[PDB]
């Protein structure tokens, strides 16, 4: 299958803005955007895995990486939402 992320952010957009649409050129723009941030944070996860010789990537390493590359209050909201997401994973 040819992987993409169309129905995902369509569901997300219906969750946040249930009377707003988007175009296919913009859909490709956000596809390039999600691939860019995914590749950036995965390269960061690899390099600060490689800095302290740790062969396993856990949540706290890339947590510190998103404290690194993201600026302040976005990093605070991201780490709060991430911590509540992994605690509602590990609660179940």
């Amino acid at each position: 299958r040819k992987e993409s992320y169309a129905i995902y952010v369509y569901k997300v957009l219906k969750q946040v803005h249930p009377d707003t649409g988007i175009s296919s050129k913009a859909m490709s723009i956000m596809n390039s955007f999600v691939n860019d941030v995914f590749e950036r944070i995965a390269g960061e996860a690899s390099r600060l895995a490689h800095y302290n010789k740790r062969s396993t990537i856990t949540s706290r390493e890339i947590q510190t990486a998103v404290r690194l590359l993201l600026p302040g209050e976005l990093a605070k909201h991201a780490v709060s939402e991430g911590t509540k997401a992994v605690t509602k994973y590990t609660s179940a």
Partner: protein, 79 residues
């Protein structure tokens, strides 16, 4: 030869979308010089990209990963 294709009103439109009010006559040849060296650098990336894959076409992925290589990447044509 074929370097005057970006002629004077095209550079005038680029200046008007860039924010500069008054234009002197020496701006045009300098702007097309930096354009023909910048696009030369991008095509210089693209030739090694094409000859690496043994593939003789240049797609939008080629120029998008090349803009990723010089750190001026663009969204819309893959990531």
């Amino acid at each position: 030869d074929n370097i005057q294709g970006i002629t004077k009103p095209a550079i005038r439109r680029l200046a008007r979308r860039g924010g500069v009010k008054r234009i002197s006559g020496l701006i045009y040849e300098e702007t097309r010089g930096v354009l023909k060296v910048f696009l030369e650098n991008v095509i210089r990336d693209a030739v090694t990209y094409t000859e690496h894959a043994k593939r003789k076409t240049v797609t939008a992925m080629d120029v998008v990963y090349a803009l990723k290589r010089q750190g001026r990447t663009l969204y819309g044509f893959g990531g």
